């Protein structure tokens, strides 16, 4: 049988569904661990496989197959592209994956296909998943109700500040630069000591960002404006 429907209600319902799903579950990072859902699922799958930092490598195809067959119901080429970026020294300030093979270069060359390479976990990536088996976080269901995935990681590293993030959503976006680990740790210790420290006090320990490719920052006003409100503009200049 045929039942009528008005175009306004259909448009509104469909667009709100899409917008809310994209905003909450695809493109923005959590403030506690600094990861998107795909990064978290990849790391959890590698941890379950037993792929540690002091053992032998494994082929990328096996990991991609596990990830898209148990946790992530999407295509595999984009998952491989996501995995490739987490292993490049000119993309992440502190890499999370250890690679063996041709993973591209700063000159603009592309990486090899996934039938040629091998990966394993990095040493610092074991600090993002410490004490995972002692009931410190909540678990949720997958798309079938057959497996379980962590809701957040019990990290010891302030990952959001030290690695940054960038994503595009519907109605909003984000852009965060990376920093230096020692300075962030000193700032955290100062906050623990004081609990009422101002922005000027925190800048005694964290003067500004720190990019993986060095170069020069030209000016200081945008840094202070961004740290005080949340939006600012800086200039990066080659040497």
């Amino acid at each position: 049988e045929i039942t009528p429907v008005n175009i306004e209600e259909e448009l509104k319902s469909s667009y709100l569904d899409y917008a809310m799903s994209v905003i909450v579950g695809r493109a923005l990072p959590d403030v506690r661990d600094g990861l998107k859902p795909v990064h978290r699922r990849v790391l959890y799958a590698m941890n379950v496989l037993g792929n540690d930092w002091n053992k032998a490598y494994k082929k990328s195809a096996r990991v991609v197959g596990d990830v898209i067959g148990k946790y992530h119901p999407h295509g595999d080429s984009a998952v491989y592209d996501t995995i490739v970026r987490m292993a490049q020294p000119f993309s992440l300030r502190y890499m999370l994956v250890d690679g063996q093979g041709n993973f591209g270069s700063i000159d603009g060359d592309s990486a090899a296909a996934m039938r040629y390479t091998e990966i394993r976990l990095a040493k610092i990536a074991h600090e993002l998943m410490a004490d995972l088996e002692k009931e410190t976080v909540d678990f949720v269901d997958n798309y079938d109700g057959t497996e379980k995935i962590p809701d957040v990681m019990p990290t010891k590293i302030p990952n959001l500040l030290v690695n940054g993030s960038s994503g595009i959503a519907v109605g909003m976006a984000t852009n965060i630069p990376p920093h230096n680990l020692t300075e962030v740790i000193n700032g955290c210790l100062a906050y623990i000591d004081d609990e009422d420290i101002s922005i000027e006090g925190l800048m005694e320990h964290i003067p500004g960002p720190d990019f993986p490719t060095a170069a020069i920052i030209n000016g200081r006003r945008g840094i202070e404006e961004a740290y005080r409100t949340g939006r600012g503009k800086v200039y990066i200049r080659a040497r």
Binding site: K134, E135, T136, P158, G187, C188, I199, L202, Y227
Partner: protein, 147 residues
């Protein structure tokens, strides 16, 4: 939309929550271990009556039922039980009737089941000494966790 201080505060609160939950988990595990350790330690002093009771039982279920029927005398383990102050090593789901009442120990079903699974190689002299060391270590760990 956040600034630097909000991010730092969120990180600190996350750390506090994680540490608290880990501590609770470990304390519960330690108490659960100490319960079974007490149960096993008590039954190595009444070995002959235990064996005599078990031999005449025709079915393991009947032996389990007969085990939790009457209190058992403490014997030579009263000292290490007295060293435990109040109920620091007592699980929080345990009813008040079980445990030590007046120089006589009262068992539960799980303790009887654990007794029935004891291997014969633990009747040697050396294997008996590990219980006291493990018990003292568990008590120290429980105190440190409670702090």
């Amino acid at each position: 939309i956040m600034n630097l201080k909000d991010i730092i505060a969120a990180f600190v609160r996350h750390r506090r929550e994680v540490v608290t939950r880990r501590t609770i988990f470990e304390l519960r595990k330690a108490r659960d271990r100490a319960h079974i350790l007490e149960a096993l330690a008590v039954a190595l002093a009444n070995i002959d009556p235990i064996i005599e009771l078990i031999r005449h039982a025709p079915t393991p279920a009947e032996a389990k039922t007969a085990l939790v029927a009457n209190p058992w005398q403490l014997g030579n383990v009263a000292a290490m039980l007295e060293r435990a102050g109040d109920d620091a090593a007592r699980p929080e789901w345990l009813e008040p009737e079980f445990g030590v009442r007046d120089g006589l120990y009262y068992l539960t079903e799980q303790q009887a089941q654990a007794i029935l699974d004891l291997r014969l190689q633990k009747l040697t002299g050396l294997e008996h000494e590990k219980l006291l060391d493990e018990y003292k270590e568990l008590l120290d760990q429980i105190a440190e966790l409670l702090r």
